[PDB]
């Protein structure tokens, strides 16, 4: 009386703590800077939910600053990458010089403001 092999999920983890036999339960998860899409677990009944998906979590793109550029500014920004701000000639940089992308409750938003430009 055991359940199909669970299988694999790319970018995610299939947790099997107590077997696969019937009343058995299977949970699932990803690698950081992604988030589950689907059935968070399937229950051994043959399995009850089929797998989900496991989608990279990016952040929104990065916020620009008056007398100051980012350098080298590329389209997609996920865990852990980061953004550098520099400012204009003239002008002195208060704050911190790069912010970087987090994941919060499966939501990609940035460490934290912005640094400033000052003259």
Known sequence: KSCPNPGEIRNGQIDVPGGILFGATISFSCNTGYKLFGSTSSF????????????????????????????????????????????????????????????????GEWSGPPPECRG
């Open 44 to 107: 051994c009944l043959q399995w009850s939910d089929p797998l989900p998906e496991c989608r990279e979590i990016y952040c929104p793109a990065p916020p620009q600053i008056d007398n100051g550029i980012i350098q080298g500014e590329r389209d997609h920004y996920g865990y852990r990458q980061s953004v550098t701000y520099a400012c204009n000639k003239g002008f002195t940089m208060i704050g911190e010089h790069s912010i970087y992308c987090t994941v919060n409750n499966d939501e």
